[PDB]
């Protein structure tokens, strides 16, 4: 319908999910699609538990964690959440820089200046039409190859152990369960939005795995080589990226104002790109595992606050196993990070 589709295209609209559902297809092919499944399901749990708690004993999570926790722990959770929104804005400026260099070819510094003056410009239907049009653009090839061979033969979970194998999956599932959706008639619109746009992500990844897996060539991490051919569809990919970044800017920075009030300070990572010693293309995926490390700190308070003062949320089945599986995975990739 016209509601959940726009709510979905806007709901994802970040460079991180583009830049990790196009790495999983270039290295771990269809065998990674499953995580995207697990990426949405628990997420559709979590936000529901936020909608299940956001009206009863009404307050956003930053208002709650200031009510009954020690002060040093409040400073620690503000370090954690501020590094979370900081890393999200790093994702915004990075992806928008790669987009501006993907269009006019401007250096990422001048691209960051243009994103600064677009932050000046911020003070809708066309953006959702761009992410909707690239979303249908990846629904052009959601049909395209071996529907029962590589697909369902890889949606069943593999226990792969390698550093990059679990690192990239942790980046994907750490980018989908965005920490700022946890800081929050309505349930159906979001279950269908995240539902269909889950097909946008499985489409993006599967097409990223069928477009070139065994072909080798230049890696898909740059996103400059991510323009798939059916000419103008490439510029459509770059404009879709730029729109996704510029909108995730306002949404994630206003959300950072919600977590922060209860501007340029998050722009310091935005110019770490000038370090020149390492290329930015794949520090965005890291930007989604660091963002992943800020998820348990955003999940424990919901899990514990859900069952005291309020009705509903008595179910503690999958919603509590997901946090311990989550933390054991991120402690696998964190305890092997040396």
């Amino acid at each position, epitope marked *: 319908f016209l509601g959940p589709a726009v709510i979905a295209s806007i709901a994802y609209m970040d460079p991180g999910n583009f830049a990790t559902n196009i790495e999983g297809g270039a290295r771990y*092919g269809y*065998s990674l699609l499953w995580v995207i499944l697990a990426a949405n399901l628990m997420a559709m749990v979590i936000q529901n538990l936020s909608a299940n708690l956001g009206i009863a004993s009404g307050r956003n999570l930053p208002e709650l964690i200031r009510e009954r926790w020690p002060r040093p722990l409040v400073w620690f959770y503000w370090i954690q959440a501020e590094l979370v929104a900081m890393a999200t804005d790093l994702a915004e400026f990075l992806g928008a820089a790669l987009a501006i260099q993907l269009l006019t070819g401007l250096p990422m510094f001048w691209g960051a200046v243009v994103t600064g003056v677009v932050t000046f410009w911020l003070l809708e239907l066309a953006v959702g039409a761009f992410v909707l049009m690239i979303g249908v653009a990846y629904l052009v090839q959601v049909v395209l*190859a*071996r529907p029962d061979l590589a697909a369902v033969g890889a949606g069943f979970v593999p226990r*792969l152990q*390698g550093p990059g*194998s679990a690192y990239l999956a942790v980046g994907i599932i750490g980018a989908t369960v965005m920490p700022h959706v946890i800081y929050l008639l309505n349930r159906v619109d979001v279950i269908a939005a995240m539902g269909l746009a889950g097909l946008i992500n499985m489409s993006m990844l599967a097409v990223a795995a*069928a477009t070139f*897996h*065994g*072909k*080798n*060539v*230049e890696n898909a991490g740059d996103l400059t080589t991510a323009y798939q*051919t059916l000419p103008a569809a490439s510029v459509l990919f770059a404009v879709a990226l730029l729109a996704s970044g510029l909108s995730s800017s306002a949404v994630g920075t206003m959300a950072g104002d919600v977590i922060m009030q209860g501007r340029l300070i998050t722009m310091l990572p935005a110019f770490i790109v000038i370090l020149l010693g390492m290329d930015p293309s794949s520090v965005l995926i890291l930007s989604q595992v660091i963002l992943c490390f800020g998820v348990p700190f955003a999940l424990v308070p919901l899990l514990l606050f859900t069952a005291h003062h309020d009705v509903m949320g008595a179910l503690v089945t999958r919603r509590s196993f997901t946090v311990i599986g989550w933390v054991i995975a991120v402690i696998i990739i964190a305890l092997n990070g040396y």
Partner: antibody
Amino acid sequence: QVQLTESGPGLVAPSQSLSITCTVSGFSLTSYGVHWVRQPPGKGLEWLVVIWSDGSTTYNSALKSRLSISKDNSKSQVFLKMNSLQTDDTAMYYCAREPPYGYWGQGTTLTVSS
Amino acid sequence: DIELTQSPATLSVTPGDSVSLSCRASQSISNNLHWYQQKSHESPRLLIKYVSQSSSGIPSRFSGSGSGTDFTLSINSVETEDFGMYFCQQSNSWPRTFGGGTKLEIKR
């Protein structure tokens, strides 16, 4: 200088087993997928199988359930292996790996007759 | 399951006149195709990636031209060092499929 080299030629009886060593040099084997290409004495060739690094074997339907592909990153060797009955498939085998292809091995001769 | 019929099967040239190999497809495969030269008892170095971009370390004599369901390699002034086999490989979909091949020969 990027370079691939293979195992020495082999002559085996029918219903025997065999293996071939496609060892690599000059590139990061753990970062590239190796394809196998079989050329009979002069009767064209068709794509065989691909082993993506970290063990990901995909066999074609033509040569499935007979061939197997081991990998050893410790010495960066890509092992080809044939067991079962041998039914005198006799050919020179090839391996390939580089972002656009174009770095193939010298090939290895393999003859089967009793 | 896509195939690639390659014609002509064998080709004679003086050398001097330009030759043009045809690698007809079974269905559309986009610009996913590879051109290889080969000599007797040798490993085939890559010539043409994607039918348009000439591959790394390849003389400007060769040029691939084509679009869609069929593609053609073309050599101008054969130069006595382009004789022998030529193979053609799609790479878009499993299984990868090589062409019928051609053996270029000297003509007199």
